[PDB]
Amino acid sequence: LLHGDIMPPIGLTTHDFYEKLQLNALKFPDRILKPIMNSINPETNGLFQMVATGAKGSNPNMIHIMAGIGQIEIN
């Protein structure tokens, strides 16, 4: 953006294209689970057992609790 290299496609302004690029860049990768499961004993971890068996919680809940919340998206 600073060097004037961001060229929006036909249909988006530079602001909208930049926001879309930033939103895509700040999504957590799939390998964020690797540090979480390296620290978790799945046969013993109560939180992981509740999340994985479907009793309560999901993967995003565990990621937010342990690794990071990430980008706050509103609308």
């Binding site: 929006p8 036909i10 249909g11 609308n75």
Partner: protein, 146 residues
């Protein structure tokens, strides 16, 4: 869900549109799905992007920076644009079969084209000239040297 214009799906906007039988002009998240009329070329992403950018609505107003209507005929001139007669005579020289007609009246618009929008939308001056000339019957249009 998105809240911006043209894709307003936040809250009950879409369900109220459905249940209230709101007209087309009252819909804030209208969408359409179009299939190419060629089963064997639907595979080409470049062709699909070409068609999608071709059917995207672009108006004259989208490409206007500012416009000024004038009470001047041609065959006097607002002082702020007295320098326009240079490219005006250049247009007269470069378009022999586009001389001003003998029903030219006083009223005339002078519009400044937005070059940034023209570049971003891949809009050419010839596209404007032909989309306004073979569109408007009682008119005489002139452009600068692109």
């Amino acid at each position: 869900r998105s809240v911006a214009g043209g894709t307003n799906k936040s809250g009950i906007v879409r369900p109220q549109e459905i249940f209230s039988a709101k007209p087309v002009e009252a819909e804030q998240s209208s969408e359409m799905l179009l299939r190419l009329k060629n089963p064997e070329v639907e595979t080409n992403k470049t062709y699909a992007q070409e068609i999608a950018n071709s059917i995207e609505l672009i108006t004259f107003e989208r490409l206007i920076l500012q416009w000024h209507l004038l009470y001047e005929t041609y065959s006097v001139m607002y002082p702020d644009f007295a320098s326009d007669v240079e490219w005006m005579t250049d247009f007269l020289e470069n378009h022999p079969l586009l001389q001003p007609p003998e029903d030219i009246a006083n009223w005339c618009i002078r519009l400044e084209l937005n070059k940034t929008t023209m570049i971003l939308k891949s809009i050419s001056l010839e596209s404007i000239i032909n989309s306004l000339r073979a569109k408007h019957p009682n008119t005489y249009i002139m452009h600068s040297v692109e």
